[PDB]
Structures are given as structure tokens and as C-alpha cells.
Chain A
Amino acid sequence: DNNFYSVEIGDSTFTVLKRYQNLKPIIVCAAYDAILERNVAIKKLSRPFQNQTHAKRAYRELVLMKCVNHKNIIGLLNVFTPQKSLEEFQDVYIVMELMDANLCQVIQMELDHERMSYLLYQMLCGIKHLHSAGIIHRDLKPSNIVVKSDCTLKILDFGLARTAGTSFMVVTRYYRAPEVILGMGYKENVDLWSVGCIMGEMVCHKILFPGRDYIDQWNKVIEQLGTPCPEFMKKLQPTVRTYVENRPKYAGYSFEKLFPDVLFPADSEHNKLKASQARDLLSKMLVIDASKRISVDEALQHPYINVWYDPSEAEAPPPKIPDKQLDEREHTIEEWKELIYKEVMD
């Protein structure tokens, strides 16, 4: 029957369960779960089965949000559709944990070393868990990372082609790793480049590499970090190597010049040391050559991060994803509707 009530939230309508009360918009609502007695977030996906792109994205997010459980990754609390049959099926509502803000607000703060390293520690724990689950985000950025007033942090979604709609409605290119831009493959640590850019932006309160397009992104990188060595050029493909090796050559500033001590809190024997550790970690993440860039595991062992290490958070068991669910299998719009409906019906 109809255990629902519809509410006008802007242009569209929100037909949710009566357990969720007082819907406030943030194309995603915030409500109070009277059963769980705590505020939640409600995302609405209208006709996700309409085409391949929307359908794949929604299918992965559902499957993955159900399987993955980590406290630094936003979790699924509930999922329902107000329609009662496959013929009438239309919308999907995904109830999630509610957070207070995204990093874009934290970046404008002058944080202390404890909060900075603790926020970063949580980022890496989440990233690591995703990796163990065979998920490389490939699209980290401050708008994808959300925080709470108790200084907790979570990763908001699963990234490229695994996300459907924006909760906390920041361009991707600013944080995209060069191996992608230069036509090279990618391994787990592309996400670590982004952490480097996000960490840097936190330090100096500015976008590290603000380019006009993807290509200009490469110009902003070598201007700051210096043209890479010839052993890296040999890994490029002919067309890319021809373009890269005809760029103006840049020496690149040291990470002391990129991130001086004035940017950090430095008024103590402990603070001036902590400033160098953050700079060291930055110099191990912001590395063009991904073969010389450290891993997520190594980032968690760094002196700047390891203070908070807890094996229950940084070494949690990986999830068991059902076999061959996230492949590039093409389907009809009706096949998608049935797969998605099967995952949403009560």
C-alpha cells in the first residue's frame, strides 16, 4: 500500500516513507529518520534506466553502496521506490548518512597539524578500502569529500562511471593525475595525486594547478614541479612524447618554495617539525612519475599520518562484490529497468 507522503521540494516532488520527516533540499534532500532517530540524506534518481550511461552509473552505485561498509565512506541506510510494479517503476530513492559540509569549506580554514593530519588519515583509510574492493575512485576532489562538526570525514561517492547525481552540488581537471592526461595507464595511486592536490590546497588555500583545459593542466604542472626526466618521456606514446618534449623546459621549484613554513603553523619544536613532515608527504604524493609516487599503504605509514593509525580502520577486510556485476555489459532499456528494479523493490 501507500506508506508514503509526497512533498514539493523545488521543481520535482519527493515521495518518501513517512519515517523520513522534514525534508530540506541540499537535487538531494535532508530528512529526519524517525525510526533511526537521526538525520539522513535522501537522493532521488528519476528514471535511471533511461539510457546506458545513467543506467550503468546507477547500477554500480546501488550494488556498491550495498556491499561496501567503511566509516570513512558514506554508507547506504535504505533504498526504496514509491511505485509498486515493474510497469509503473520510475524513481529510485537512496537514503544515506548526512554530513555537514564538504572540504571546500575546510580549505578556507587555517587548520592545526592535529586536525589536518587526522582528516587526511581518514581520507586515506577510505581510499584504501575502496582500493581493496577493486575500486579506484579516479575523480577525488574537495566537493567529493564531506566532513562533520566532530571532525569526522567520509568519501562521498565511488567516482568515474560509478556515481549517479551529486549530493553536495569544483572542476575535475584541477585534480586529475598526469598519467591520465598523457595517455598512459593508471594504477591505484592516481587517487594519491589528487590527495596531494587536495592536501596542498588545504595548506595554501589555493588551487595548486588552475588550468583552462586538460592540456593546460600539464603546463601548470611542469611549471611548478619541473619537466620530468628523460626516463619518464620514454614511457609516453609517440604523439604524446612529441607534444611533451616540445614544451618549454622548466626546472620546477622545490617543495620548500612551493610550501614554505609560513603557510603551516610553526611556533614550536613540534610544530616546525610537523611542518616538514607535511611537506615531505606532499613531495611523495605530488610526483608526476607514478612509478616514483608512493602508495596509499605507504602514505598511512608516513610520520605525519601514522600517529592516528588503527588496524581496525586502515586494514579492514575487503568487501565481497558479487561476481561480474560492474562489467561493461550492454543491455536494453528494459533489461536495465528490470535489473535496477530488482535491486530496489522491498
Chain B
Amino acid sequence: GSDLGKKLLEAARAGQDDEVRILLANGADVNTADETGFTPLHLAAWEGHLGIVEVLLKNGADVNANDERGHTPLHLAAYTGHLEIVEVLLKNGAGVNATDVIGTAPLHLAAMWGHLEIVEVLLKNGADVNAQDKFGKTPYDLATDNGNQWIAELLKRAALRRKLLEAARAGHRDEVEDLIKNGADVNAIDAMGLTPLHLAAMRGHLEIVEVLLKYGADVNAEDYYGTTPLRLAAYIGHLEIVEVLLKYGADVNAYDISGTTPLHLAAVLGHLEIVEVLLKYGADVNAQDKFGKTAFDISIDNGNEDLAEILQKLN
């Protein structure tokens, strides 16, 4: 192919930080592929050159580039065991659950070869514990088959947090209570901070919300964006759930980064009954959001005129 590229492929593989800098400065294509699809980011990730990886990425390297077998730079780092590269690639937008021609993901490789910190990093970044390859093997199975027993414990723990979260997402109340009784954490979170209570509120499943609150769930749990279960219920329009949440101690005047309270949110779509309950528990109508609008001002901007006639009387 290109001449400046073949020099960038071998320069990155050799670890020549200065040669890569000059080749990219002179005008070398950062995403040139070899006979079997490997790019300079593949080679620097396979040989463990953190400096070159950070250089190629700043010049616009495809983080999630595939090869002939479907392997990405994260598959390689997960295989070789380079933690810092896994961390740099993830922070640049790598596919955590990228799979190859047989369904192998970076967590299969990390668990198979006993790379602990990578198994832990991949899980924080949302790696699918239940993921299987085309032969039905999970990361837990590989860790077991290769004597990585502590990794198997961690993967089994993560598999249980996953079973509770998915039960709140689309499971029966019985399963949620079985998992709790059998030692599942009500405050378990996913990669984005969602608890079983967040997922239950959105779903509208009162029965599950009650069980979680009963067995210790945090009513004021914030996710990656600062969202609580009360604000989700208040916006979506789950009256009954807004009631048990406030019963179990949910803060009515809690506001996110934009200064939005549950009262502000119920006024978007005009949930009359929800606003009644909120004001009962002491929702402040003087509260102003990041723009300065009160719950009253929102009802006007959304045409929910029946709701605005209630707030003007107070303020």
C-alpha cells in the first residue's frame, strides 16, 4: 500500500516513539492496514507501547478497528495483559464487548489468562458477564477451566448483581426477593450507576419497588447523571411509586445539576396527581432551576394549564 504507512507500521511495532512522531508529523496515514487488517494501533497495543498508543490516538486512530479474525486493539491488550493500554483504549471509546469470529470478547481473554486487574477494569466499563462464545463458554467458565478461582468468584459475584438488576428490569417480584434472601445487594449498580430501584421506578413495578425499599434500598441513589428514582417516577408519571418513595424517605426538594426537582418534572407532562402528593410532602414552588423557572413557569411553557392554576394560588 502506502509507503509512509509501512514505515509507520514497523515504527510503532518497534517502539520508536520519535520515528512515529516524525512519520505522523510528515503526513503518515494513522489507520493503514496490513495484509490481515492490523493497524499501527493493533501493533502498539500488542507490543505494549503505552506512549505510542497515546500518540496514535491523539492523531485520530480508530479505537475499535477490526482485523481478519475480528480482533480489535482491546482483544490484544486483554490477551497480552497490558493494563495501562486497556485503560487508555477504554477511555478513548473502545468496544468493551467487541466480539471476534467465534464470539470471544475481551473478558473471555482476561479471565482465560488470569489478568485480574483487566477483568476488574472490563467489568467497571460494562463488560457483559453473561456473554458467551459460539461454543457456549462464559468468562466464568474459562476462569474455572484454567484455575483462576479468585477471578471466578468475582465473575460469579458480578453475575449475581447482574441477575438482580435484570430481575428489576423485566423479572418477577418472587425472583427479586429470592435473590435478596439468597444474598444479593439491593444497592448493586451497573456501569452507569443504575440500581435495581432506578430500573424498578422506570418500569413502574410497584411490587418490586416495595421489596427493595423494605430490604434496604437507597431512595436517594444517584446514577451517572445524578438522577434519583423519585425524579424518574415524577417525570414518567408513576403516581403509586412517587408515593412509596416519599413514604420511605425520598427527598422532595432534591435537585440535580440543572436545579430540577420532582415538582419541575411532573409539570413537563402535567401529572396532576403526582404534583398533589409532592406538595403534600412539602415540595417548594419557589425553587428555581438553572434557568430560573419555577414549577409554575414550566406548566405555562408546556400548556398544562389545569396544573398551572394550582401553583399560581400558592405562587
Query: Which residues of A come within 8 Å of B, CB atoms?
Result: 51-53, 138-139, 160-161, 180-181, 183, 186, 213-215, 237-243, 245-246, 328, 330
Contacts and interface: CB of A to CB of B under 8 A. Distances in A.
A186 B302 CA distance: 10
Contacts of A238: 225-227, 231, 256-258, 260
B202 A215 contact: no
Contacts of B312: 52, 330
Contact of A180 (B235, B256, B302, B306): B302
Indicate the size class of the contact surface on chain B. 20 to 34
B225 A242 contact: yes
A215 B227 contact: no
Contact of A241 (B198, B202, B225): B225
Contacts of B231: 238-239
Interface string B182-225: 00000000001010001100100000000000000000000101
B300 A243 contact: no
Nearest to B224: A242
Nearest to A52: B309
B236 interface: yes
Contacts of B256: 237-239
B227 A214 contact: no
Which residue, A239, A246, A330, has most C-beta atoms of chain B within 10 A? A239
B237 A215 contact: yes
B249 to A, nearest CB: 19
Contact of B269 (A53, A215, A241, A330): A215
A186 B268 CA distance: 13
Nearest to B256: A238
Nearest to A184: B268
Given A239-B235, A243-B202, A246-B202, A53 B309 contact: yes
Contact of B268 (A52, A183, A213, A241): A183
Contacts of B232: 239, 242-243
B20 interface: no
B118 interface: no
Nearest to A182: B268
B305 interface: yes
B195 to A, nearest CB: 12
18 contacts: A51-B309, A53-B305, A53-B308, A139-B303, A160-B303, A161-B303, A215-B236, A215-B269, A237-B258, A238-B257, A238-B260, A239-B231, A239-B232, A239-B265, A241-B225, A241-B227, A246-B194, A330-B312
B93 to A, nearest CB: 11
Contacts of A214: 269
Contacts of A186: 301
A181 B269 contact: yes
Interface string B283-315: 000000000000000001111011011001000
Contacts of B225: 238-239, 241-242
A230 to B, nearest CB: 11
Contacts of B235: 183, 239-240, 243
Nearest to A240: B235
Interface in B250-267: 256-258, 260, 265
A186 B303 CA distance: 12
Contacts of A242: 194, 198, 202, 223, 225, 227, 232
A243 B309 contact: no
A161 B237 CA distance: 23
A202 to B, nearest CB: 25
B47 to A, nearest CB: 32
A246 to B, nearest CB: 6
A139 B303 CA distance: 9
A217 B297 CA distance: 24
B301 to A, nearest CB: 8
Interface in B9-61: none
Nearest to A238: B225
A180 B308 CA distance: 17
A330 B300 CA distance: 13
A240 B234 CA distance: 11
Contacts of B192: 245
Residue among B198, B223, B260, B268 having the largest count of chain A Cβ atoms under 10 Å: B268
A183 to B, nearest CB: 5
Given A180-B302, A330-B312, 18 more contacts: A53-B309, A161-B303, A181-B269, A183-B235, A214-B269, A215-B236, A215-B269, A237-B256, A238-B225, A238-B260, A239-B232, A239-B256, A239-B265, A241-B225, A242-B198, A242-B223, A243-B232, A245-B192
